[PDB]
Amino acid sequence: RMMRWNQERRRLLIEDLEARIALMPLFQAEKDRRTLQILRENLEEEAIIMKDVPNWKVGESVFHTTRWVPPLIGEMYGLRTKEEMSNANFGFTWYT
Amino acid sequence: IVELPTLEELKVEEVKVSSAVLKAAAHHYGAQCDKTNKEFMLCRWEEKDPRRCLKEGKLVNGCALNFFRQIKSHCAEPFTEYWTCLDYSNMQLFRHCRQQQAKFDQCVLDKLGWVRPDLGQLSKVTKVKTDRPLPENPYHSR
Amino acid sequence: MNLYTVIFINILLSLTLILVAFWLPQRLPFSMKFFLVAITFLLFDLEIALLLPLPWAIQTIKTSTMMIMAFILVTILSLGLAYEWTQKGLEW
Amino acid sequence: MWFEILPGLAIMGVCLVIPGVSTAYIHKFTNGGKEKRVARVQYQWYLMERDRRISGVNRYYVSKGLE
Amino acid sequence: MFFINILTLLVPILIAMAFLTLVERKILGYMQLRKGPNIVGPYGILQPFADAMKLFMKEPMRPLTSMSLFIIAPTLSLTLALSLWVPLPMPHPLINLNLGILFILATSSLSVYSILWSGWASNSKYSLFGALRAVAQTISYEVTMAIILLSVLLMNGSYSLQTLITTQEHMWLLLPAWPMAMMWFISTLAETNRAPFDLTEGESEGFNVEYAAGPFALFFMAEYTNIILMNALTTIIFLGPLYYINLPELYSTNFMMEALLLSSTFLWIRASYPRFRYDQLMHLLWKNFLPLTLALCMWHISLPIFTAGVPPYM
Amino acid sequence: ISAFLKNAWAKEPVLVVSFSVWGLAIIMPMISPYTKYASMINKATPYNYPVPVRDDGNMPDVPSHPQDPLGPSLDWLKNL
Amino acid sequence: RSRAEYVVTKLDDLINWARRSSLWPMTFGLACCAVEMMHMAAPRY
Ligand SMILES: COC1=C(OC)C(=O)C(CC=C(C)C)=C(C)C1=O
Numbered sequence: 001r002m003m004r005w006n007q008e009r010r011r012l013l014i015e016d017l018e019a020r021i022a023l024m025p026l027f028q029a030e031k032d033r034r035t036l037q038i039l040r041e042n043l044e045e046e047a048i049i050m051k052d053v054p055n056w057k058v059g060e061s062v063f064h065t066t067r068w069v070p071p072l073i074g075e076m077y078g079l080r081t082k083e084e085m086s087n088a089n090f091g092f093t094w095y096t
Numbered sequence: 097i098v099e100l101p102t103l104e105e106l107k108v109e110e111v112k113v114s115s116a117v118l119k120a121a122a123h124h125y126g127a128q129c130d131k132t133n134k135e136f137m138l139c140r141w142e143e144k145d146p147r148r149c150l151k152e153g154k155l156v157n158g159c160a161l162n163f164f165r166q167i168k169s170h171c172a173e174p175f176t177e178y179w180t181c182l183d184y185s186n187m188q189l190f191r192h193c194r195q196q197q198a199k200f201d202q203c204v205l206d207k208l209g210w211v212r213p214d215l216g217q218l219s220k221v222t223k224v225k226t227d228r229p230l231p232e233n234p235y236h237s238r
Numbered sequence: 239m240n241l242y243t244v245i246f247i248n249i250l251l252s253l254t255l256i257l258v259a260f261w262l263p264q265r266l267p268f269s270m271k272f273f274l275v276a277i278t279f280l281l282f283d284l285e286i287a288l289l290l291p292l293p294w295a296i297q298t299i300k301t302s303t304m305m306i307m308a309f310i311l312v313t314i315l316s317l318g319l320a321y322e323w324t325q326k327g328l329e330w
Numbered sequence: 331m332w333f334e335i336l337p338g339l340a341i342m343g344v345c346l347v348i349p350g351v352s353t354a355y356i357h358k359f360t361n362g363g364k365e366k367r368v369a370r371v372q373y374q375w376y377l378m379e380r381d382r383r384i385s386g387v388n389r390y391y392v393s394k395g396l397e
Numbered sequence: 398m399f400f401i402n403i404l405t406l407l408v409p410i411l412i413a414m415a416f417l418t419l420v421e422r423k424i425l426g427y428m429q430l431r432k433g434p435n436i437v438g439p440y441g442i443l444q445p446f447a448d449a450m451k452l453f454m455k456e457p458m459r460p461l462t463s464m465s466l467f468i469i470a471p472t473l474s475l476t477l478a479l480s481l482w483v484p485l486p487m488p489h490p491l492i493n494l495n496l497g498i499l500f501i502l503a504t505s506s507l508s509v510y511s512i513l514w515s516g517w518a519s520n521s522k523y524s525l526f527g528a529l530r531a532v533a534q535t536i537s538y539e540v541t542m543a544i545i546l547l548s549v550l551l552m553n554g555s556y557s558l559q560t561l562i563t564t565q566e567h568m569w570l571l572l573p574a575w576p577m578a579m580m581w582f583i584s585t586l587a588e589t590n591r592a593p594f595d596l597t598e599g600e601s602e603g604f605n606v607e608y609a610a611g612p613f614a615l616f617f618m619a620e621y622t623n624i625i626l627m628n629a630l631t632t633i634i635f636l637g638p639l640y641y642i643n644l645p646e647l648y649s650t651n652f653m654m655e656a657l658l659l660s661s662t663f664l665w666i667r668a669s670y671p672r673f674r675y676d677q678l679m680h681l682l683w684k685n686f687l688p689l690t691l692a693l694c695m696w697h698i699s700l701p702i703f704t705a706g707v708p709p710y711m
Numbered sequence: 712i713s714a715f716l717k718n719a720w721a722k723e724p725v726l727v728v729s730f731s732v733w734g735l736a737i738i739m740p741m742i743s744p745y746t747k748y749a750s751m752i753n754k755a756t757p758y759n760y761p762v763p764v765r766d767d768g769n770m771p772d773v774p775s776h777p778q779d780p781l782g783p784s785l786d787w788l789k790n791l
Numbered sequence: 792r793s794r795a796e797y798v799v800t801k802l803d804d805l806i807n808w809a810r811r812s813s814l815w816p817m818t819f820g821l822a823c824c825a826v827e828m829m830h831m832a833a834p835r836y
Pocket residue numbers: 817818819820821822825826828829832
């Protein structure tokens with residue numbers, strides 16, 4: 001019975017993973033836009049805040065290469081409301 | 097600079113439906129629109145950046161959007177019953193709801209003509225040909 | 239957090255009780271076997287720690303290597319036990 | 331006879347079902363009439379938070395085809 | 398709300414914890430041809446509250462001893478035992494932890510210290526001798542206790558206690574794996590220092606020797622809560638109560654019934670058996686049970702693979 | 712040798728069973744009609760998104776709808 | 792009532808009830824009168 005039950009359970013599992021797989025294209029998309037937007041929002045504010053700073057390039061890749069590099073959590077939510085940052089940082093370890 | 101795209105460039109209609117809604121229609125979505133879903137994805141993997149493939153991303157939600165409009169036009173309440181029961185469960189498990197699933201699945205085959213994809217046949221790798229060709233310097237390395 | 243909330247209530251409930259308790263009523267180490275047991279215990283503990291990942295490793299694509307590895311670990315420790323049972327070990 | 335050990339047990343049992351019924355209704359009342367979703371893997375959280383970001387400020391609120 | 402859900406899940410257990418001593422002093426009684434305590438209150442219902450008040454009022458004599466490894470020890474014992482009820486998955490749990498059984502195994506392991514700390518703190522010979530032996534069988538039994546769980550998990554797929562409700566939707570894990578249930582039950586009897594395996598603090602008065610009044614009570618409370626918790630873990634891991642997603646309480650109703658019966662069983666075991674010798678006890682675990690457990694552990698890594706039954710993660 | 716096993720089954724009736732299991736677990740995997748499935752059933756379970764390849768041409772890869780008859784199948788998993 | 796004296800008496804009583812309901816004895820068991828106590832512990836009494 002255990003052999004048959006887990007084989008069934010496995011069939012249900014493959015289905016659910018297949019399900020996310022299908023929806024992954026979308027989420028990838030929404031995130032991409034959200035993420036890019038997030039940066040722009042904080043970056044836009046950066047222009048306002050670090051405005052009078054001398055020799056202050058509004059922003060510049062800490063690196064030399066010019067290729068897109070995924071933004072670290074801090075960068076995205078750093079200048080944002082504290083909580084927002086906390087949520088992301090300690091928001092999974094702490095269950096729903 | 098950072099050449100971060102502008103908001104107007106990244107503003108497009110949103111699906112915004114409860115994740116549960118999606119999981120219930122997930123299988124069919126994976127069926128309907130899979131070609132544009134994969135093209136956005138194929139552009140997404142090669143060119144590491146999201147700067148390049150956002151045009152494709154707007155298309156992906158655009159398909160999804162009419163996918164939903166068609167189900168609202170026909171077989172909306174069979175779907176409505178299926179999602180509500182699916183949402184109640186904590187892990188939104190598919191097997192707790194099979195009676196609702198059957199009526200939702202049978203209708204849309206009857207009216208939309210779509211089909212629930214058999215176990216598998218969504219995981220299998222797809223071939224989608226896209227105009228833009230892979231860039232020889234993806235990492236843009238010296 | 240959710241857990242923290244519960245735990246601090248848990249300590250509070252116990253500290254409350256001990257306090258009430260106090261406030262309301264106003265060398266031979268012969269058994270190196272003991273030590274021996276205890277040495278074994280960690281060798282077994284450590285072994286458990288190696289076996290603890292087996293639930294995730296079951297799903298490993300290899301499978302053959304998984305079992306080949308796991309069976310070797312269990313067998314070699316058990317032999318360790320066996321030798322504990324050959325000399326005057328585990329016989330306190 | 332042995333009839334009497336039951337009183338005590340009754341008060342044990344009643345005190346071991348409360349917890350299971352309690353935890354399982356303070357969830358269905360602090361999660362909008364629906365079991366509290368279980369975020370075990372990153373994806374379950376995403377959809378959980380995506381949903382939050384979807385409408386209102388709470389996940390149980392579930393926007394449907396009519397949105 | 399969450400706070401209310403902390404009262405429930407605690408008080409209710411504490412009140413039930415009190416009613417276990419009563420159902421122990423009556424079930425042992427009738428088995429021995431005696432009514433047991435019925436004169437205080439109606440049918441002895443007020444009896445548990447009565448000695449609690451007597452215990453707290455009597456002087457907590459601090460021996461002419463440490464004063465912390467003495468007060469930390471009962472606080473730790475009650476704290477860990479009541480804490481381990483946090484993740485238990487009655488219907489749905491209070492704090493669902495993805496690695497739940499490792500939490501229960503780790504929290505249990507920490508209680509061995511309280512015994513070690515209390516024994517060192519007392520500074521009298523009876524206490525130290527008792528603690529050293531007590532610590533020895535507790536951790537000795539932990540080694541088979543842990544391996545027995547690892548066999549279970551591998552057939553459950555995960556460490557989360559919540560998964561077993563979905564694993565045991567068709568059959569109890571006793572049918573399969575009964576050989577370990579027995580070995581889980583005997584190990585549950587050792588880890589709660591109950592009778593067959595209760596050499597410490599025997600008629601030989603170990604770590605209560607110097608403990609009276611409030612400290613006595615806290616461990617005391619701890620032991621009995623544990624007595625329940627471990628029995629409850631048997632009633633989730635091996636005896637899987639029927640679960641219906643539509644009505645969650647029949648799960649808790651049957652959890653109530655099975656837990657009480659297996660809690661009744663260790664009460665029944667105590668009156669029925671003489672206590673084992675210190676070495677007799679370790680002879681069982683290292684000679685009789687550990688070879689059985691390690692081998693049956695391998696059988697539970699093999700049963701999945703060649704029966705193509707590898708359990709679904711998640 | 713029979714005695715080595717008849718008294719060891721009467722007295723010491725734990726190590727006998729213990730070893731027996733050790734072995735039976737060391738054999739069943741080798742000989743079984745399902746052992747192979749484990750590495751497949753777990754292999755199949757799709758956890759990470761399956762990235763699609765460019766269609767240079769002349770390929771048997773399922774193009775378009777994954778439902779295309781081409782590609783891998785788990786009917787072995789079904790009706791298993 | 793609230794005049795403390797009454798309140799005190801009631802409280803004392805509770806305290807007395809707890810000690811008087813649960814008395815835990817210890818039997819040095821010198822000599823034989825111990826056998827007559829084991830009888831108390833036993834089922835008739
Ligand atoms: C006759 O010798 C005695 C004992 O051993 C036989 C006891 O255990 C005890 C202890 C028994 C009770 C009633 C607690 C007593 C009284 C005693 O004197």
